[PDB]
C-alpha cells in the first residue's frame with residue numbers, strides 16, 4: 001500500500017517519513033502547499049455565490065408562473081431545489097474545510113459534504129432518466145402529463161436516497177478524497193465492517209450503468225425510428241453536460257476501486273472531485289440558453 | 304514604534320520576538336492564520352469573476368447602441384474601462400498575492416496593485432465631479448453636450464494620473480498594508496527621500512477635499528433652487544452615496560495612521576477597509592442597471 005489508512009480515512013501519501021496526520025485533526029499542508037488549498041476555497045466560494053442565486057431564481061420564476069408546468073419545467077424545478085441542498089447542505093462545509101485545509105467539523109462534516117453532493121448528482125441522473133422516458137413517449141408515441149412528471153420527481157428522490165443514504169448508516173461510508181477537502185464513497189479500503197465492496201458494485205450498476213442504459217435506449221429509439229424539438233434538443237445537452245461533469249470522477253473512482261493501495265497522489269482525485277461540483281450550477285444555465293419560454297419568463301420576473 | 308519598519312515596508316506587527324519578515328520575501332503567516340489569507344483570495348476571485356463580465360458588458364452595450372450618447376452614458380463607459388484596468392491590471396496581482404500570503408512579484412506587484420486601484424478610484428471620484436457639474440448646468444440652467452462629456456472623460460484621466468502616477472516615480476510610494484496583501488500610499492513612514500508627507504497632504508486636498516467641495520456645492524445649488532432628467536439626477540445621488548460608503552472608511556483609517564504613525568494597530572485595522580474599497584471596480588454598473596431604464600433595456604436587447 002502506497003498510502004496511509006486510518007480508522008476512517010485513506011490519505012494518498014506515504015507515511016514513511018512520519019509526517020502524515022489525520023484529515024479530521026490537522027491541516028494537510030504536508031501533501032499540498034497552502035496556496036493550493038486556497039484555490040479550492042476560492043473555487044468553492046464562486047460556486048456558492050453563483051449557485052445560490054441562479055437556482056433560487058429558477059425556483060422562484062417557475063413557482064410564480066403557472067404556464068411553466070410541463071414535465072421539463074417540473075424536472076428543472078426539482079434540480080433547482082436539489083442544487084440548493086448541495087450548495088447549503090454540502091458546499092458550505094466544502095468551503096470551510098478548504099479554508100482550514102482539513103475537516104474541522106470532523107466526520108460529521110465529511111458526511112455532510114459527501115451525502116448532499118452524492119444526493120444532488122443522483123437526483124440529476126435519475127431526472128435525466130425521467131426526461132428520456134418522457135421524450136421517448138412524446139416523440140415515438142408507442143400521454144406523459146403533469147401527474148407523470150410529479151411522480152417522476154418523487155421517483156428521483158427515492159432513487160437518490162437509495163444511493164446516498166446507506167453510507168450514512170453503515171453500508172459503505174463517506175471518506176475524504178484527494179487533498180482531503182471533499183468526501184465521497186470509499187473506493188480505497190475493503191473495510192468489511194461496512195461491506196464496502198458490495199456497495200461500490202451496487203452504486204455503479206444500479207445508480208450509474210442502469211440509468212445510462214435506459215437513457216441510451218430511449219435515445220436509440222429517437223434516432224433509429226417545433227416546440228417539442230426545443231425540449232428534445234435541451235435534454236440532449238443535459239445528458240452531454242452530465243457526462244462531462246461526472247465521467248472523469250466516475251472513471252477515476254472505478255480505477256481506484258480496482259487498484260486499491262496503488263501509487264497515486266492527492267491531485268489524482270482532487271481535480272475530478274471538485275470539477276464534479278459544478279453539477280449544482282450548470283443545469284439552470286442550459287435552461288436559460290435553450291428554453292425560450294423560461295428565458296422570457298425569467299426576464300419578465302427579473303425586470 | 305509598535306510595528307516594524309523595513310526599507311520599503313511597514314509591517315503593523317512588533318518584531319520584539321523576531322518573527323517579522325519582509326512582505327516581499329516570505330509568507331506573512333506570523334501575523335494571521337492561513338485561512339484568513341484564503342478568505343482574501345476567495346474574495347478577490349469573486350470580484351474578478353464578477354468585475355470583468357459586468358464591466359465588459361457595460362462597455363459592449365454602450366458601443367453597440369448609438370442611442371447611448373448622453374453625458375451619463377459616456378461617464379459610465381469611462382468607468383467600465385477604468386474598472387477593467389482595475390480588474391486585470393491590479394486585481395490579478397491581489398489574487399496571486401493573497402494566494403501565497405505575500406507579494407511574490409516583489410515591489411513591482413505592489414506598484415501594480417496600488418497604482419491601478421488608486422487610478423480607478425480617482426477616475427471614479429473625478430467622474431462624479433464631472434457629473435455634478437453636468438447636473439448643475441442641466442437642472443439649474445445657469446448646454447452640456449457630447450463635447451463637454453468627452454472633455455470630462457479626458458479630464459478625469461488627467462487628474463487621476465496626477466494622483467496615481469507620482470508614487471511610481473519618486474513622490475511618495477506604494478507600500479503593503481494590513482496583512483500585507485494589497486498596497487496603498489505610504490502613510491506609515493516619513494521616508495523623506497520620497498517626500499512622503501507632502502504627497503499625502505496633496506492627495507487629500509487636491510484629490511479628496513476639493514472634489515467633494517465641488518460635488519456638494521453643485522448638489523446644494525440643486526436643492527435650494529423633466530422625468531428623464533429626474534432619473535439621471537437620482538442615480539447621480541446614489542453614485543455619490545455609494546462612493547462615500549466605499550471610500551470614506553479607507554480614507555479615514557489612512558488619515559488616522561498618517562497622524563498617528565507608529566501607533567498601536569494590527570494587521571486587521573487596514574485590511575478590512577482596504578479590501579472593502581476594492582468593490583469600487585464592480586458597483587457602478589450595478590447602480591446603472593438598477594437606475595437607468597434606457598440602459599437596462601438596451602442591455603436586455605443585447606443579451607437576448
Ligand SMILES: *[C@@H]1O[C@H](CO)[C@@H](O[C@@H]2O[C@H](CO)[C@@H](O)[C@H](O)[C@H]2NC(C)=O)[C@H](O)[C@H]1NC(C)=O
Pocket residue numbers: 004005006015017018019020021022
Ligand atoms: C505517521 O507516522 C508517525 C510516526 O510513526 C505517527 O506518529 C506516531 O504515532 C504514535 C501513536 O500515536 C506515537 O506514539 C508516536 O509518538 C508518534 N510519533 C510522532 C513523531 O509523532 C503518525 O501517527 C502516523 N500517521 C498516521 C496517519 O498513521
Ligand SMILES: *[C@@H]1O[C@H](CO)[C@@H](O[C@@H]2O[C@H](CO)[C@@H](O)[C@H](O)[C@H]2NC(C)=O)[C@H](O)[C@H]1NC(C)=O
Pocket residue numbers: 307308309318320321322323324325
Ligand atoms: C526581526 O528580528 C529578527 C531577529 O533579530 C531578524 O532576523 C535577523 O536578521 C538579521 C539581519 O537580517 C540576520 O543577520 C539574523 O540572522 C536574523 N536572525 C534570525 C534568528 O533570523 C529580522 O531580520 C527582523 N525582521 C525585520 C523585518 O527587520
Ligand SMILES: CCCCCCCC/C=C/CCCCCCCC(=O)OC[C@H](O)CO
Pocket residue numbers: 143145147148
Ligand atoms: C411500491 C409502490 C408503488 C406505487 C403503488 C401505487 C398503488 C398501486 C397502483 C395501482 C395503479 C392504479 C392506477 C393506474 C393508472 C394507469 C394509467 C394512468 O396513469 O393513466 C394516466 C392518464 O393517462 C392521465 O395522465
Ligand SMILES: CCCCCCCC/C=C/CCCCCCCC(=O)OC[C@H](O)CO
Pocket residue numbers: 069146147150153154157158
Ligand atoms: C425526504 C425525501 C422526500 C421524497 C418525496 C418527495 C415527493 C415530492 C412530491 C411532491 C408533490 C407535491 C404536490 C404537487 C401538486 C401540484 C399540482 C399541480 O400543479 O397540478 C395540479 C393538476 O391538477 C394535476 O393534474
Ligand SMILES: CCCCCCCC/C=C/CCCCCCCC(=O)OC[C@H](O)CO
Pocket residue numbers: 243244247248251252255263264265268
Ligand atoms: C461524451 C463526453 C465525454 C466527456 C468526458 C471524457 C472523460 C475522459 C476521461 C475519463 C477519465 C478516465 C480515468 C482513467 C484513470 C486511469 C488513470 C491511470 O491509469 O493512472 C495511473 C496512475 O498511477 C495514477 O496516478
Ligand SMILES: *C/C=C(C)/C=C/C=C(C)/C=C/C1=C(C)CCCC1(C)C
Pocket residue numbers: 113114117118120121122125182183184185203204207208246249250253272273274276277
Ligand atoms: C465533491 C463531492 C463529490 C466528489 C461527490 C461524490 C458523489 C458520488 C460518489 C456520486 C456518484 C455518481 C453520480 C451521482 C453520477 C455518476 C455515477 C456515480 C455513481 C459515480
Ligand SMILES: *C/C=C(C)/C=C/C=C(C)/C=C/C1=C(C)CCCC1(C)C
Pocket residue numbers: 416417420421423424425428485486487488506507510511550553554557577578580581
Ligand atoms: C487594495 C487597494 C487599495 C487600498 C487602493 C488604494 C487607493 C487609494 C489610496 C485611493 C485614494 C483615494 C481615493 C481614490 C478616493 C478617496 C480619497 C483617497 C485619497 C483616499
Ligand SMILES: *C(=O)CCCCCCCCCCCCCCC
Pocket residue numbers: 050299302303352353356357599602603
Ligand atoms: C432586468 O430588468 C434586466 C436584468 C439583466 C441581468 C443581467 C446581469 C448579468 C451580469 C453578469 C453576471 C456574470 C456572473 C457569472 C460569472 C462567471
Ligand SMILES: *[C@@H]1O[C@H](CO)[C@@H](O)[C@H](O)[C@H]1NC(C)=O
Pocket residue numbers: 001002259260261262263
Ligand atoms: C504501490 O506502488 C507500486 C509502484 O507503482 C506498485 O508496484 C504497487 O503494486 C503499489 N501497491 C499496491 C498495493 O498496489
Ligand SMILES: *[C@@H]1O[C@H](CO)[C@@H](O)[C@H](O)[C@H]1NC(C)=O
Pocket residue numbers: 304305563564565566567
Ligand atoms: C506604541 O503603543 C503604545 C501603547 O498605546 C503607545 O503608548 C506608544 O506611544 C506607541 N508608539 C508610537 C510610536 O505611537
Ligand SMILES: CCCCCCCCCCCC(=O)O
Pocket residue numbers: 248252267268269270271272275
Ligand atoms: C475546460 C474543461 C477542463 C476539463 C477538466 C477535466 C477534469 C478531469 C481531469 C482528470 C484528471 C485526473 O485524473 O486527475
